[PDB]
Amino acid sequence: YSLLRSCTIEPECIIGQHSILMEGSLVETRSILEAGSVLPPGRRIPSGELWGGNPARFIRTLTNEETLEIPKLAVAINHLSGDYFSEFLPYSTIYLEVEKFKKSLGI
Amino acid sequence: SAKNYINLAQIHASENSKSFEQIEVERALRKKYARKDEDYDSMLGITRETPPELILPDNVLPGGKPV
Amino acid sequence: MFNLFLAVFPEIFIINATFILLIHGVVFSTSKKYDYPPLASNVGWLGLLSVLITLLLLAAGAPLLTIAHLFWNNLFRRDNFTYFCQIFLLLSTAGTISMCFDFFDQERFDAFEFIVLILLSTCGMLFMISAYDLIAMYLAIELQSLCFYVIAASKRKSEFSTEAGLKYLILGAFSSGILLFGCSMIYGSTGATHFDQLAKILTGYEITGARSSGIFMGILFIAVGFLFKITAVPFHMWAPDIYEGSPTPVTAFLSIAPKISIFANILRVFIYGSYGATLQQIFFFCSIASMILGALAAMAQTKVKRLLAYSSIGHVGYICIGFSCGTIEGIQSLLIGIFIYALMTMDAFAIVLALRQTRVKYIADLGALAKTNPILAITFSITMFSYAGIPPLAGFCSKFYLFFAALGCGAYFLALVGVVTSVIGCFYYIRLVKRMFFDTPRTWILYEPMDRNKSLLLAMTSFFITLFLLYPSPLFSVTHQMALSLYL
Amino acid sequence: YFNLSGLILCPVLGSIILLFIPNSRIRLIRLIGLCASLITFLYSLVLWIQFDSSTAKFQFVESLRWLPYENINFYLGIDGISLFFVILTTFLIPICILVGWSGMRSYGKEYIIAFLICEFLMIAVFCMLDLLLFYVFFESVLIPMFIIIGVWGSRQRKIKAAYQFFLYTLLGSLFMLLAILLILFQTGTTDLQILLTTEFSERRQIFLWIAFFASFAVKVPMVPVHIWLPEAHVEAPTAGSVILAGILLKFGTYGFLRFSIPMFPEATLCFTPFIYTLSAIAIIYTSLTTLRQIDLKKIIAYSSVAHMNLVTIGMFSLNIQGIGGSILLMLSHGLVSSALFLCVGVLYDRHKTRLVRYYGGLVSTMPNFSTIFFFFTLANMSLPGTSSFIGEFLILVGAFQRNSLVATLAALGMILGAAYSLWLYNRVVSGNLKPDFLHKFSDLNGREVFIFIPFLVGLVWMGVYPKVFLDCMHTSVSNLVQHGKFH
Amino acid sequence: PISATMVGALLGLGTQMYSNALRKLPYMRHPWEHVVGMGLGAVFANQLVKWDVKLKEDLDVMLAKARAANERRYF
């Protein structure tokens, strides 16, 4: 439930759920956006700062150990998506069901 | 915005309702005219224009670019 | 009557297929029924099939192709050396034409005349290897020269392609004039244009006993023209500009297909027409200069095509090391180096064409390539190391045996300069490595995936490079047989 | 019937199988890598049992033709000298996989692939009898260790360490290669047995020996070029830092014991005083330099240099005591330096300091690691009953059979070696704690307390009963020292 | 022992998966061409071995001829 629209997100910018990013927002590199954050149009997030609350509100600073975990999270989600990708092969066989249904009535 | 999305919805209506036979022609035309070459086309004396089916209406453009 | 042409089928067939392809392309590129179809990939696939068929014709005619050798004597003389040289040049041409198919449709360059000119220049090269006379030598040189002059300026929108084509034209015309002036006096002072009778009038008396100012200077001019042809330092006036400006598939065909045929031609001239031992000196200094200047100049380049050009110049010097030491081992090392350099150049240009899909220009654009496409990064690193001469790869064997040949003749200075130029040469190769594994730029360039033919060729060449040292006997035996077949 | 070829092929199979599987299933990758390393280790131990120590000729030989003329070919084979190096290099690799076991999800499959390639290549180096191809595999380790150092190394100076390491092994390596080619052209073959029984010109052996030493004086940390080891070793990963000081430093000494001592006997005698002076000044200078170091890694990297330099004193003193003590101290160092660098690695992977002054008085907090570190730095002292003493004292005895000055300086090396070793021990494990920058920190878990157990048992087995090791080598060492010495 | 087919087929499968990975595809995208690559690798390795044998014997003949020709200068 990330409501992105005409935004600009830099690398390592993990975004929480129910994020309502407006147009023109610039989430600068290495930033964290807590769940439910809604930032007004034109507002920017300074690097290394995590924000939360209904409006764009500074919460606390970031340390190197916390910062470096964002790429690890991204590659973990990538690994999960790679596991999910192998589930379905190209060119699904659903067309057999359609052809059988067509053969069952007329042609 | 309310007035613009009205004419924005027409292309989605005319696209989601396309028949499969129309979709084959659409994909073939899209792949055929993906990239151009002024050199060879001019050498042959021909100009490759985009097909009418591959022209979006001007009202959904970023503000009007007929050319 | 007709059976006297059994020795020219691998060439008559390629000419006929070239004509058929030209006719088909010109007929069906202007048909209004099909609305001027882009039949460049079609002509390319048909040309690749034709190259494969004439390769099959050439391979199965090993007992043949030596019949009616008296009738064809004045025109050409093909033997075991010529047979293998042609069978390898044609394979290189097939690989080059195969790895450039995506270039036709990715950037919409549907000019089938490119393929027909590749085929016809390949026919000219096949003439050159069999050529056994000065006239046929010059004509076969001129076939490929004119084909490449036409092809280099094919892309008529970029100022690089046109200017590089014009520079190549002027340089090649000057080189051809120099070579032809050289041959004119060797004909004048002895008659006997034929190589067989040129190797018999010069072997009688050494140049040291009495001085002939005509034959010596004609041989010198022929050597100078040939060094211009292979772009050997100091005769490297515009070669980096030629390789940078020319289209990527053209440069892929260059520096592999022309150099092999020209080196076979130089072998034929050097072995027979040179008995004064005066070409040792001209090859010595020029190869040393090529080594030093390639090593010292490729480290200062920031683009990719210029780096490949200077690497080609350096490897030309490394191969030319074999001319200075005239022995069986010297020619063996020379041919092995040519073979390995051809494979590595094909692999490197496959890499370059792969990243050409997104218009790679500099060396910094391929930054953090180990993340987006790790396996292509590994392949490029392996190919670069093979260029460097690292032991556990092909390319080290060629440099090894070239050094062995150099030390066999007592040219101890050649070995030392080879070692030092290798030391500097590996440095900027590893510099290429650092920007492509270790340091990650802020902005990343994304490359779209490759196609099957380039990937297959790249995989085959990569497995050849790494696993060559496990089983190198066939190449060594081919090369030893080829070196001895120059005489018997 | 287990031959030498299967040992070489096992890491190859482990690497090829590992590439087939994807990277998502990380547990499979680490499990299969560890299993392959361990089965290779077991195979190496099996090869030990079926080793004839009575005969002087080489053990299992597998010949694979390389040139079409069978002029030169892969001639594998072990002897009394090469067997223990093979065992050590098979033993160190599973430890290398095990140290970084927690971070395998961060490294990936390239890490285990690189380490198994290193194991394969390092095994191929020690157990082969072709002089030229031994050179090929001798610097073939450039690529995998370059990858290991560069990809997972320091913060931003990782590039410079890779370049210094790669640069020091180019000029000397190819200057050796020139001598390789002269030997090949002069004799005709590079087979070791053939090359041993050849009359080399009296003036020729000087040049060839100098060329060989030039490429071995860089692998063995000699006086001119030894600054790479400290910098390129601190700027290295912990598992890459445990084989760099565990195997690579043995290539120079083993190369001296294989292709330098036999082939050029009178050249060895003529160059004997020069090597003595170089080794003595290296020992003294390194000992004085290492006692004012603050880097947590170089402090023992210089100890490694001192031990390796002391090795050559008895390695070049032609004697059964000298050479036997040379290999015994070589194995002893391969164990003790590995253990010390693992201790430094575990210390660094918790606190991430790479300094010496930060740590202090942690004995009250990590007693197990304190005892293990004490035992390792205690072995580094060369106590009798530990690994280093028997070999090192044998080197001293052998050199004092030949000369009475230089190896007295070698013995003076240990008058300061033990001193700064205990002083270094007392920087860290002694004194009051400083909980201003040591808030939270733990002790060794089950993995790294068990990883030292093989080190402990091997160390004590070296110390109390080294007869079994001396038993298998006295034939080979005596054959080595008497070659070309008819009288 | 390896019979030039346990290596040729393995190299064919390896190069098939290698080309398959360079296009950022799943390794076993098309196993039919994997089998084709195995067969092609086996055939190519067998042909390489046979050609090596023929080439070595022909080279031995050439060296014998060259040595006989060179010997004639002394006698």
Ligand SMILES: CCCCCCCCCCC(CCCCCCCCCC)(CO[C@H]1O[C@@H](CO)[C@H](O[C@@H]2O[C@@H](CO)[C@H](O)[C@@H](O)[C@@H]2O)[C@@H](O)[C@@H]1O)CO[C@H]1O[C@@H](CO)[C@H](O[C@@H]2O[C@@H](CO)[C@H](O)[C@@H](O)[C@@H]2O)[C@@H](O)[C@H]1O
């Ligand atoms: C690229 C990486 C290589 C990595 C593999 C290295 C592992 C080393 C094994 C490599 C390998 C295959 C090469 C595979 C190359 C890969 C394919 C490349 C393209 C991939 C698509 C060659 O290995 C052997 O081949 C012998 C060939 O003769 C050679 O022996 C020398 O030869 C003389 C010359 O004349 C010399 O004078 C002489 O000194 C030696 O006798 C040597 O090369 C070597 O002994 C394995 O051996 C294989 O070849 C032969 C041998 O028996 C076998 O078939 C034979 O066929 C009949 C003969 O027609 C025989 O009658 C028949 O009895 C036999 O069945 C095979 O079953 C298999 O054993």
Ligand SMILES: CCCCCCCCCCCCCCCCCC(=O)O[C@@H](COC(=O)CCCCCCCCCCCCCCC)COP(=O)(O)OCC[N+](C)(C)C
């Ligand atoms: C080459 C070796 C030859 C053999 C040498 C053996 C000599 C003994 C070697 C170990 C000596 C003990 C040194 C251990 C480190 C000293 C500091 C330390 O860490 O002690 C540990 C462990 O203490 C020990 O010393 C136990 C180790 C065993 C000591 C006895 C050794 C007996 C076996 C060796 C000799 C066997 C006979 C010879 C074998 C052939 C914890 O001490 P705590 O009293 O628990 O202090 C608590 C910490 N804090 C206050 C912060 C809470």
Ligand SMILES: CCCCCCCCCCCCCCCCCCCC(=O)O[C@H](COC(=O)CCCCCCCCCCCCCC)COP(=O)(O)OCCN
């Ligand atoms: C050396 C020892 C180590 C290497 C060992 C090699 C082992 C033997 C080789 C094994 C190869 C196995 C490959 C599996 C079979 C794949 C066959 C697929 C063929 C195919 O799909 O046809 C086209 C692909 O192009 C093509 O595939 C045809 C182009 C292939 C280029 C080959 C060029 C040969 C001539 C030059 C040889 C090298 C000379 C070097 C001096 C259509 O493709 P598509 O349907 O996917 O879509 C269109 C993309 N365009």
